[PDB]
Write an enzyme that holds these catalytic residues in place. Structure first.
Site, mmCIF file in Angstrom:
data_model
loop_
_atom_site.group_PDB
_atom_site.id
_atom_site.type_symbol
_atom_site.label_atom_id
_atom_site.label_comp_id
_atom_site.label_asym_id
_atom_site.label_seq_id
_atom_site.Cartn_x
_atom_site.Cartn_y
_atom_site.Cartn_z
ATOM 1 N N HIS A 47 0.826 -1.197 0.000
ATOM 2 C CA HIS A 47 0.000 0.000 0.000
ATOM 3 C C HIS A 47 0.864 1.253 0.000
ATOM 4 C CE1 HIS A 47 -4.117 -1.703 1.403
ATOM 5 N NE2 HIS A 47 -3.488 -2.559 0.620
ATOM 6 N N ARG A 60 -6.294 -9.764 19.942
ATOM 7 C CA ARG A 60 -4.844 -9.850 20.061
ATOM 8 C C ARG A 60 -4.167 -9.865 18.695
ATOM 9 N NH1 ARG A 60 -0.772 -13.584 19.710
ATOM 10 N NH2 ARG A 60 -2.276 -15.055 18.808
HETATM 11 O O1 Y2A Z 1 -5.165 -10.785 -4.899
HETATM 12 C C1 Y2A Z 1 -5.909 -10.413 -3.962
HETATM 13 O O2 Y2A Z 1 -6.329 -11.220 -3.106
HETATM 14 C C2 Y2A Z 1 -6.311 -8.969 -3.811
HETATM 15 C C3 Y2A Z 1 -6.706 -8.241 -5.082
HETATM 16 O O3 Y2A Z 1 -5.950 -8.714 -6.132
HETATM 17 C C4 Y2A Z 1 -6.296 -6.790 -4.971
HETATM 18 C C5 Y2A Z 1 -6.151 -6.311 -3.534
HETATM 19 O O4 Y2A Z 1 -7.089 -6.244 -2.834
HETATM 20 O O5 Y2A Z 1 -4.931 -5.897 -3.030
HETATM 21 P P1 Y2A Z 1 -4.964 -5.082 -1.619
HETATM 22 O O6 Y2A Z 1 -5.281 -5.991 -0.479
HETATM 23 O O7 Y2A Z 1 -3.610 -4.483 -1.438
HETATM 24 O O8 Y2A Z 1 -5.965 -3.970 -1.647
HETATM 25 C C6 Y2A Z 1 -8.164 -8.435 -5.427
HETATM 26 O O9 Y2A Z 1 -8.468 -9.253 -6.324
HETATM 27 O O10 Y2A Z 1 -9.046 -7.783 -4.824
#
Ligand code: Y2A
Ligand code: COA
Ligand code: COA
Ligand code: ADP
Lengths: 1034, 181, 92
Positions: free
Chosen positions: A695, A723
């Site tokens: 991120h 936790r």
């Molecule tokens: O591959 C995955 O499980 C997550 C993602 O590709 C993208 C995503 O959410 O990345 P992020 O958690 O950083 O926001 C999806 O298909 O939504």
């Protein structure tokens, strides 16, 4: 993503690009030394080493160097030569991390006092840029707005209250010149301490800076090939920059940070919030020193990008051996739009390419993944375990997320049984209409599949906007019924024809989402904007936040999947396919409304709430950027002011002070509903050095922004904080059973949803249906990695040096012909290439060319004259001579047979060239056939027929039509590739018709191109060449 | 017959099928003649709402290149004396692969920019002569003469397999006829 | 058998609006073939059904037929009639 740059790079960027009317001094006065540098290179590249006094700075992103005994002040070149001898290449310790010294910066010394030193710091916040000033360096704050200019009149009244009068105008010329330099190159942090401005000019002594690395597409020219050094304590590796090169060439995210090359726990986790949670759980169970890397991949990477990411990871863990062994965690939450099948096919392909050294290092692989097409993603991951011998354990949606960390480290056993198994409050309703920006037909079909299962009256998507095609209608499904959704080239056509649309779902890319979002704020009907792209610069996002604040428009994003309101509306790809919608029961509203940072945990929060609670009321993923369009408090407050919400689940990351507001939202008494929160990113404090996650906003600038301190703050304010993340499920459950006991949550009656028919391609892929193929082909296969010409790949076609006649044998006969047979075919195409414009086909091409028609129509009009009287003598003579030769009669009897039937022998007889004046096309091809063909029985038969017919008239010789006809048959049945019934079939179905047609198509195109060059006008046939014999009055 | 069956498929060649060789040659030559940098050409075509012809493959993206492109590009670099339009199109390709990995030079766009490079840089043609042959459609004839080979092979294949008369299924057709108009 | 009882959905790749033949009667743009001949529209009447999908008035239908008679032929000297005669004389 704000990435720190070195002092050398930032000063070089300042000297080339600042616009200060005050003279900047000591420009380009820097020397870089390494443990593998030459002192002759310093004295030749830079001639100022001996002329002035010198100071030295370690350039490895180190602050407080003057207090750690690493700065030599006022030393000679000979003095700094022996100064670097015990330091350049030795250890150091800045805080907790330790590292070497591969970089020092040598700059000329400035004679200054403490009254000459100043301090400027420009850093970016959400509301604007803070410009700092302190008169005693070794304070004042000014806030410049997002779309406001820092004019030189404004520095004097605010930033220069304590500055001396003789130094005000030179600093206000510098500070105004520094802030424009700050804005143009997209800096997010810029600290100069100290700033010495004497009577001679402005001296920049030090410069610590951070630039927005997502703005590389804007400032590619001005930055050049800028290098981002790692923080102190960790070195840079070439495989880290290979993944960072793959990250910048697509909209997908591909991060890799190598914490320890000797670590036995390697992670390949899908999602930038899922990888943080896996890194928290690994570090929770005492695996901090053995956690080898932090790495994530998200944004739906392709099979090739996942293969390049996996084969880099597999190559890193097979360099040093470990006694206990090594662990590869291939994890991730339930995906929303990332294709798990194409993701794992790249990983399986990488594992099969590296199955050798994973047997050497005793690599155990634990897999937990859900999402779209995840069944065959986990299926082929189970097959690669057994055929390669690598122990691979495969789990799915039913397994808990961070369960496989405990199985890997040795804390829980292996479940062998379940493998292979002015903002508004109401943003969305059941009458909510959306316009989707872009061609995401699968995403839009996911919304219409959601709406029909949620028993909506109308689809969510009313129109689509794609600027690269005209206005049309795209076919979609309303369950089992096909409907049409209009597509618009322009946004203004979509907004005018659809006034009921209040949501825009912006699927534009990172370099196009800013212009699309500012264009849709010119329409007052749109109240909610969803921005899906990740990688938008933070300076451009603040302008989106500022204009949305003016227009009163909610923004969910950027870098989000969107959000889901069960029963009413979902944004794009949120919640995955309909298999995950029905598994999580997202078709009817529940009681929990959640907010979250990542879209990968939102689908995991869909699963956790569904198994412990009566359902979800409304889910929102605000996006993982540094400044989201709507924060946690903009939604947790909408949830409080909603009667359907009973409890709230909040899931944040490290960085930012947004999760503190909830405590000051609860302490004031604004939030009265039970809130269950958890901040991910507890491993970053427990790491050695600072780690920037997948991120953009997962960076802890302060100790307050850390996830451990935020979890402590929410625990003090009565927020149910577990936790760890794996204990989130029963804390949400224990709150939920508390509000059922109090009776404020009553579960509703379960109604079965309206089912949809299964997709054909999804049912065909996993084999429930069979559908007969109505076509059969044998000449070309193109649905692979390579084009294939009858079993032969296109590279082997060109490697083995077959020509046009070689690929003609592959396409028309599906055979490897010998090199004389291939070269004879090409010679047949050159002699049939053209025969002047007077022939019937070339006449028709010229008429159609002169009538202003295209190449295809003009070729065709003359090519269709080919038939029986024009161009049929190749096929007619081949059938004629083979019939006589097969039904074996002597050539004298064949001539007498055809005379009494009243038929002329086809392929016999020329108009002008008779004998001792032979046809030269015949003599070229007959000489080739005699030398190269192994046996020519039909040619020798036709030459004895020719000997008889030249005893009648000298003109009756073998034509080029009859020579090609009898020698092509001789090529088929006497080259070894063909059997007799196969060679007779190709003559019967018309292979020699195709030889004339392919040859004569060359001259007809040349006849077309000739008439276009000569610019010949429309032809009308003369009336005196036509004999009109019309009837009298019939 | 062979002539009618070739013709019925050869007449589909035009703008949406088989026109990308001639379209990309006209597209890249217009940008190169009216001299602008490849970064400005990509930005020019984005604001006009037009995709670059000869750019973009469905499956083969980067580190998995198109093999027909790699065969012909290796020949053009070794044998041609000067390829200015190819080098322009490869810098356009470097920019478009920074957006998506799939946006590479097709075999349609490779042939288009290298046939123009063959005309104005072999010494046989003047500049107004080489521009005329592209204008009157010489690269339309290159696709048509090439694809006529496979269409005859597709004809001869269906005669050997003895395939019967085709009727399209009614369930693959959506009948949206008016009520009584 | 799976499509008839509705477990799968498969997208129709073609769309047509001028003729329906999968019924008891041939239909020209919503009009059955017996009603085409009952209401005495001619070739210009069915041209309006097939090309425009509209009930045209009887003067509009009769004007279409008159346009087809005046464009019917203009001698053999024109470029298209020349090419037909060459292809006819070539035994096609
Ligand atoms: O591959 C995955 O499980 C997550 C993602 O590709 C993208 C995503 O959410 O990345 P992020 O958690 O950083 O926001 C999806 O298909 O939504
Ligand atoms: C937003 C997203 C869906 C769309 O982006 P994409 O598929 O990479 O790219 P697009 O289809 O918009 O096209 C990319 C570029 O290629 C260009 N392009 C496409 N075909 C082209 C051609 N033939 N010639 C030239 N250019 C072409 C497009 O114009 C576009 O240009 P632009 O970016 O300058 O406008 C994609 O970025 C994505 O998946 N993002 C990740 C989602 C996310 O971040 N979620 C995180 C939280 S879960
Ligand atoms: C009589 C004459 C006019 C006609 O003979 P010709 O032109 O030589 O020959 P024809 O046109 O009849 O054809 C010759 C043979 O070729 C054959 N032939 C022509 N085209 C053929 C083809 N494509 N395949 C096979 N055979 C062919 C014909 O069937 C004929 O066969 P036949 O002789 O067994 O019947 C000629 O012989 C002549 O000029 N004679 C001299 C006149 C004379 O003697 N006058 C003297 C006093 S002034
Ligand atoms: N170019 C220079 N000329 C003279 N003195 C310098 C120069 N650069 C740094 N110094 C000295 O180094 C000391 C601290 O350096 P700096 O890196 O700016 O701060 P810190 O190391 O405390 O973060 C200051 O006291 C200053 O006198």
């Amino acid at each position: 993503s704000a990435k720190a740059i070195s002092e050398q790079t930032g000063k070089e960027l300042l000297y080339k690009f600042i616009c200060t009317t005050s003279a900047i001094q000591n420009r380009f006065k820097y020397a870089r030394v390494t443990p593998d540098t030459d002192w002759a290179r310093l004295l030749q590249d830079h001639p100022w080493l001996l002329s002035q006094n010198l100071v030295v700075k370690p350039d490895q992103l180190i602050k407080r160097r003057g207090k750690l005994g690493l700065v030599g002040v006022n030393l000679t070149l000979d003095g700094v030569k022996s100064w670097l001898k015990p330091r350049l290449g030795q250890e150091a310790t800045v805080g907790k991390a330790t590292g070497f010294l591969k970089n020092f910066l040598i700059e000329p010394f400035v004679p200054h006092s403490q009254a000459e030193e100043f301090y400027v710091c420009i850093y970016a916040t959400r509301e604007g840029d803070y410009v700092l000033f302190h008169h005693e360096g070794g304070a004042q704050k000014l806030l410049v707005g997002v779309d406001e200019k820092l004019n030189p009149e404004d520095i004097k009244k605010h930033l220069l209250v304590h500055a001396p009068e003789d130094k005000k105008e030179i600093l206000a010329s510098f500070i105004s010149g520094l802030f424009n330099f700050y804005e143009d190159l997209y800096f997010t942090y810029l600290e100069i301490n100290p700033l010495v401005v004497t009577k001679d000019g402005v001296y920049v002594l030090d410069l610590a800076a951070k630039v927005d690395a997502t703005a590389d597409y804007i400032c590619k020219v001005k930055w050049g090939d800028i290098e981002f050094p790692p923080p102190f304590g960790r070195e840079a590796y070439p495989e880290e920059a290979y993944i960072a090169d793959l990250d910048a060439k697509s909209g997908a995210s591909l991060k890799l940070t190598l914490l320890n090359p000797k670590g036995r726990i390697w992670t390949m986790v899908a999602g930038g919030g899922a990888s943080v949670v896996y890194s928290d759980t690994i570090c929770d169970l005492g695996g901090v020193n053995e956690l080898a890397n932090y790495g994530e991949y998200s944004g739906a990477p392709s099979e090739q990008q996942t293969y390049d990411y996996a084969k880099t990871i597999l190559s890193l863990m097979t360099r040093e051996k470990h006694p206990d062994g090594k662990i590869l965690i291939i994890g991730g939450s339930i995906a929303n739009f990332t294709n798990v099948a194409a993701t794992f096919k790249g990983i399986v392909r990488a594992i099969r390419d590296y199955q050798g050294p994973l047997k050497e290092h005793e690599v155990t692989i634990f897999v937990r993944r859900g999402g779209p097409n995840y069944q065959e993603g986990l299926r082929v991951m189970g097959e690669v375990g057994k055929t390669t011998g690598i122990p691979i354990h495969v789990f799915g949606t039913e397994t808990h997320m961070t369960a496989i960390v405990g199985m890997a480290l040795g804390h829980r056993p292996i479940p062998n049984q379940p493998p292979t198994a002015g903002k508004s409050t109401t943003l969305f309703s059941r009458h909510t209409k959306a316009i989707v920006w872009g061609m995401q037909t699968r995403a839009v079909q996911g919304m219409l599949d959601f709406d029909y299962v949620c028993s909506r009256d109308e689809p969510s998507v009313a129109a689509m906007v794609y600027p690269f095609t005209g206005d049309h209608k795209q076919k979609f499904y309303w369950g089992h019924k096909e409907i049409l959704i209009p597509v618009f080239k322009n946004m203004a056509d979509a907004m005018r024809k659809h006034p009921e649309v209040d949501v825009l779902i912006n699927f534009a890319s990172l370099r196009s989402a800013y212009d699309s979002t500012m264009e849709t704020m010119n329409y007052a009907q749109i109240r909610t904007i969803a921005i899906i792209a990740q990688g938008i610069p933070e300076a451009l996002t603040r302008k989106l936040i500022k204009k949305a604040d003016q227009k009163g428009v909610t923004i969910i994003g950027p870098a989000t999947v969107g959000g889901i309101k069960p029963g009413c509306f979902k944004i794009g790809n949120t919640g995955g396919m309909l298999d995950n919608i029905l598994a999580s029961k997202l078709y009817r509203p529940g009681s929990v409304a959640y907010v979250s940072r990542s879209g990968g945990m939102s689908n995991e929060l869909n699963n956790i709430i569904s198994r412990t609670t009566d359902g979800v009321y409304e889910g929102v993923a605000i996006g993982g950027d540094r400044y989201p369009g709507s924060t946690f408090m903009d939604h947790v407050l909408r949830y409080q002011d909603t009667p359907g919400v009973k409890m709230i689940v909040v899931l944040g990351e490290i960085g930012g002070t947004e999760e503190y507001k909830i405590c000051r939202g609860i302490k004031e008494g604004r939030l009265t509903k039970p809130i269950v929160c958890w901040c991910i990113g507890t491993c970053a404090t427990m790491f050695s050095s600072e780690v920037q996650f997948g991120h953009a906003g997962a960076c802890a600038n302060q100790a307050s922004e850390t996830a451990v301190a935020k979890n402590q703050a929410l625990k003090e304010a009565g927020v149910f904080v577990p936790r760890s993340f794996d204990e989130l499920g029963e804390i949400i459950q224990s709150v939920y059973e508390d509000l059922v006991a109090n009776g404020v949550i009553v579960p509703a009656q379960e109604v079965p949803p309206p089912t949809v028919p299964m997709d054909y391609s999804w049912a065909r892929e996993l084999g429930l249906i069979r559908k007969p193929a109505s076509f059969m082909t044998s000449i070309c296969d193109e649905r692979g990695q390579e084009l294939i010409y009858a079993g032969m790949p296109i590279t082997e076609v060109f490697k083995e040096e077959m020509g046009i006649g070689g690929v003609l044998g592959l396409l028309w006969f599906q055979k490897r012909l010998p090199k004389y047979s291939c070269q004879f075919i090409e010679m047949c195409l050159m002699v049939t290439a053209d025969h002047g414009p007077a022939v019937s086909g070339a006449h028709n091409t010229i008429i159609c060319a002169r009538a202003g028609k295209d190449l295809v129509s003009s070729l065709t009009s003359g090519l269709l004259t080919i038939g029986d009287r024009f161009g049929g003598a190749l096929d007619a003579a081949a059938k004629m001579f083979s019939k006589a030769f097969d039904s074996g009669i002597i050539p004298m009897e064949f001539v007498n047979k055809m005379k009494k039937e009243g038929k002329l022998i086809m392929g016999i007889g020329h108009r002008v060239k008779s004998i001792n004046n032979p046809d030269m096309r015949v003599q070229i091809l007959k000489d080739y056939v005699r030398q190269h063909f192994p046996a020519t029985p039909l040619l020798d038969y036709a030459l004895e027929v020719e000997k008889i017919t030249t005893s009648k008239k000298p003109n009756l010789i073998l034509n080029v039509d009859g020579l090609i006809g009898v020698a092509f048959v001789d090529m088929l049945r006497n080259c070894g590739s063909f059997t007799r019934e196969e060679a007779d079939e190709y003559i019967d179905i018309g292979a020699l018709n195709g030889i004339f047609v392919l040859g004569r198509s060359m001259g007809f195109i040349g006849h077309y191109l000739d008439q276009k060059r000569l610019k010949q006008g429309l032809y009308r046939h003369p009336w005196d060449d036509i004999s009109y014999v019309l009837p009298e009055h019939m």
